Design a binder for this molecule. Structure first.
Ligand code: NDP
Ligand code: NDP
Ligand code: NDP
Ligand code: NDP
Ligand code: NA
Ligand code: NA
Lengths: 243, 243, 243, 243
């Protein structure tokens, strides 16, 4: 399914990013997963073993981006599949939201998509084949109190993706977004009973999503069987929102 | 894979419906495909072989629906996956559109979705597992001059699907729409050389889609890897429209 | 603002339809409001007085539609502004939904839009000016358990409107949808405390909408100041849903 | 009318911003319009006369924002209506897009919306009344080749607006977006004869929009007749895109 393809998955330490990396490996890809520390990069190298490696990447630092891409090109080849998964939250109601909480979210969650996409596009255009998949959020579509920064970044990456899709579609490259709802992570596992119940009440499916479920959606769009899907957002949210 | 799941694909004679039926068989489903005539049903039985059967079905006729589902239950079992693919066009500008052209489109393309979905839901709710997937159209979301009837039906089945999705989500059933752009079939071949050039100019991918590309999307949603996707529309249109 | 214009408002007896009629009159229109009984038509004639009249109209009966339009053409002139407000509900979970509850909703809420729009379009096309505005619902966009019929009709009229908009836009006619959320009516006034509280919890604004608020939106789109809005849905729902 | 309401319109020198400012004055608002230079501010003061004032504002500079709002509070009072109209383009295909062209668009077109909205919200929350309206673009929803930066900002401000809308709705404040299609201004005049023909071919209305048509939409949302509209995008594009 992905035999001979090279994938770059940003933020592949755990959860969604790790499930994406593992799924792509399971279906034949060579995967480079990234973390913000050399130790995180080591842990990624450890689970990937013979099927890829971990590298330290800061998606807000241009020099870090060039270093990582040159390493990949030296050891593996040109990136066929880019999965923009790295992302953070800095929640606050707007009157409490600090300028840094705004700027860091825009930089890490939106400007990252610009930087990484631009860095891989030339080789994909030459090859007349490629996949760019960004992990958005239901919050980008519905909005959410206390997450106006996160919502701005997650909505903004859809506008970005639609525009890039229009630029590259004629050369067999697709550019799409997967938008998760509530996914079980270490964060949600630490919530109280009342807090989890409050989350579940929002989801018609009546459960949290799994990291693997997001990985399944990404792997579908990354495949040869999604060649006619571009500029699309695939919502994976148990019916929490419906558009 | 779909080992031991029973799928009903309406309108499986050719084009998108046939591609869906073949894909579901290849991945382990027992498939019942339908045509509007007994001769068409036999042709379906021929290609399905030991993995399924063709039946004559008119999706506008309640007696036909009832007879077909009883035949399926007697020979195979209860339907696990319903694919509402049957559909027609009756194109005209509104000023020329005949009552029959409106009504036949509503009955064939919209009311069919109600009738078939209702007819399979009880058993899916009992098993706490099910898939309903309806083939929509880009035209349902974009609109198209000369197709106000078709657009009404294809938009209407999205509203229907979101509502049903909300009713059944907590019992492990998903209800989704796959919305193709222009696909090379007997619905499209009838266009002129300049209509085809006009359509191609609207598609960033620079090509018509293939029937197998829609089948790939349907098969993804029908699978256990799409359990957290419900009330969603998956657009497969080469970038012709982006939402 | 509407001096010299003729408006037809279907279902103008009370609530939204009556507020629409009154607002259009207040801004200079001549208004014909419709009801399903001769007595309802009388009550409309009574509030409209010198600024229009009531007529008995059944939006599912073609002969009734021709009769009403011929009366309007004789007494007033050609319809400049059509507001499709007539609509019903027949709520039920899908396994309890009767065929008549499906068919009556499609006929009254969706096929009506086809019939009335077609009946007024020729004169608007000749005049190179016109407005068609249909009252949709938030349910058409979000879906709702127990309203799959209503949701199908309300979503279907958006697809219809987009297609018709594309057909007529070049001749200065716009075709739009106003989609209310929860509006205070006689129905909601009769609800229990717990029932009203359950509704309000869904609405960030924390109140029900007024019939006049929907009328304001319709009057805006009907005006000369909305000439560049077409194929659009204007959601008036206090933030109950956001697209 | 807006008797005794104070409106701030960013970028009111010409085009859409000027039309918005003039419309709000004509309907009784006291208007503060802004330009990036003192010479531009005087030109605004000239046209506003006794009904308002021009001020120099840079929406990327926190000190400029603070100074301007203090000037408004000292002379007029607290802002009741904020119209975020200031915006720029820095067009390029992604492969040629410079870091500056990305960053300046994000700062000017997206982060400005955060900064200005935050700066007026406290007083609106105290009064239990307010309007925030941001000028988006069709490109935010559709995407456009060569405008991935602009699209990211214009999509991003929708996510922002939905989130803020959710925070403030219960206190009688609305937060909405008006999304113009192609409007005859200094942003568009720079296109070639064949670009203009290419744009016109994409607009069913068969014409560019007027600046006053956007002002009409803004004025409707700013009014007391749009109290139940929040978190909404009002598309004013002649049918160029339909959602
Ligand atoms: N419910 C959920 O969890 C949902 C998550 N998402 C999205 O999924 C993605 C994964 O996040 P989440 O699920 O919270 O799980 P994590 O917090 O495990 O994933 C975030 C990853 O991003 C990396 N990262 C953070 N900052 C930077 C930076 N400056 N440069 C490079 N990498 C960075 C982290 O690296 P490190 O490991 O080195 O710290 C980490 O691997 C995000 O984009 C998030 O918005 C979307 C919808 C729902
Ligand atoms: N082709 C395209 O570009 C696109 C197609 N679609 C949708 O995809 C679906 C399949 O389209 P496509 O393969 O192109 O179409 P085809 O016309 O090739 O096939 C239509 C199928 O539906 C069956 N059918 C028609 N009427 C009825 C009825 N009353 N009861 C039961 N079955 C019926 C036909 O049966 P029989 O063989 O007996 O005539 C046939 O098997 C449709 O829903 C269509 O709207 C959507 C977007 C684009
Ligand atoms: N919360 C709400 O109330 C909302 C309502 N809407 C929509 O607003 C519209 C008004 O409905 P509602 O608010 O329930 O108030 P009403 O029930 O007062 O309005 C319905 C109107 O439709 C007329 N009508 C019913 N059947 C027919 C028919 N066959 N032919 C012609 N006219 C008919 C009725 O006529 P008569 O008076 O003669 O009985 C009545 O005037 C509907 O389209 C509804 O879907 C949308 C969103 C929210
Ligand atoms: N024209 C069109 O077709 C469309 C426009 N839009 C949007 O409409 C809005 C106005 O567009 P339009 O009238 O065409 O544009 P113009 O270029 O005519 O005007 C832009 C305005 O924004 C001001 N401005 C620019 N940068 C800054 C800054 N850093 N701080 C404060 N003010 C600034 C300008 O000030 P100065 O005069 O001092 O330079 C000017 O008043 C924009 O947000 C644009 O994206 C959306 C869709 C279509
Ligand atoms: Na989708
Ligand atoms: Na809208």
């Amino acid at each position: 399914s992905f035999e001979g393809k090279i994938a770059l998955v940003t933020g592949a330490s755990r959860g969604i990013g790790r499930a994406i990396a593992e799924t792509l490996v399971a279906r034949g890809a060579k995967v480079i997963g990234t973390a913000t520390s050399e130790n995180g990069a080591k842990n990624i190298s450890d689970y990937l073993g013979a099927n890829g490696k971990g590298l330290m990447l800061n998606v807000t630092d241009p020099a870090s981006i060039e270093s990582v891409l040159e390493n990949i090109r030296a050891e593996f080849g040109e990136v066929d599949i880019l999965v923009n998964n790295a992302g953070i939250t800095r929640d606050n109601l707007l009157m409490r939201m600090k300028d840094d909480e705004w700027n860091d979210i825009i930089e890490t969650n939106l400007s990252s998509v610009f930087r990484l996409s631009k860095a891989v596009m030339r080789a994909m255009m030459k090859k007349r084949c490629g996949r760019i998949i960004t992990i958005g959020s239901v919050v980008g579509t519905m909005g959410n109190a206390g997450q106006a920064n996160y919502a701005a970044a997650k909505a903004g990456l859809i506008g970005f993706s639609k525009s890039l899709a229009r630029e590259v579609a004629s050369r067999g490259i697709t550019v799409n977004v997967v938008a998760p709802g509530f996914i079980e992570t270490d964060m949600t596992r630490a919530l109280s009973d009342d807090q989890r119940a409050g989350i579940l009440a929002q989801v018609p499916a009546g459960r949290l999503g799994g990291a693997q479920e997001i990985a399944s959606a990404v792997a579908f769009l990354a495949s040869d069987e999604a060649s006619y899907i571009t500029g699309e957002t695939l919502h994976v949210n148990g019916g929490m929102y419906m558009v």
